[PDB]
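Weekly sync notes, structure subgroup
Attendees: PM, AL, DS (notes)

Item 1: joint prediction request from the bench team. They want all two components modeled as one assembly rather than separately. Inputs as received:
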Amino acid sequence: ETQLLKGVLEGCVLDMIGQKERYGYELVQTLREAGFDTIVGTIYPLLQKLEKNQWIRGDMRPSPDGPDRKYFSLMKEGEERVSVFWQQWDDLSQKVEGIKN
Amino acid sequence: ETQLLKGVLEGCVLDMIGQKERYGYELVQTLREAGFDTIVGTIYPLLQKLEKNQWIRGDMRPSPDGPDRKYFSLMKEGEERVSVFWQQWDDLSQKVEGIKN
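Output from the run, pasted for the record:
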């Protein structure tokens, strides 16, 4: 949808991958549990973009049940992009607050 | 710059035009005073997009000194887009808070 929405899920997906190495299915479920109730296969295109951008990397390893899944973890560029995100989020939040009132 | 940043200034520019009918120069100055210190002619491309999108309209009328300036005011679509913005901003703020902690 909107530029704002895309910016937020980028930062959020990047942050989640930073906290814990996650595969595609478990990222969508973590996203839903955070409040993204209404996300329809719209997440893996973003994961595809980030991997190709060399922000994250996908490596095959065993999930907790025992099938191999592609786990995403942050690259050097990705952990910079998420620190950028949190600084930009903190900055824009206080700006928006000021305008609102 | 980023998708997040673009989304924020869109909403903010739209909101400012809603509060008070403004021309290009005075919008940039209102934006700087809100915290956008480091915005370089990057604002008028956005105003151009919104006018063409029929979200805002530009009409020529006298500024407080007496020269005619193009004042931007919200169209029917624009005032919907800003209510959408504030709902989306409120929604994403509480989601991001939840993920952060």
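Discussion: Helices of chain B lie at 3-19, 24-34, 44-52, 76-100.
Action: AL to compare against the crosslinking data before next sync.
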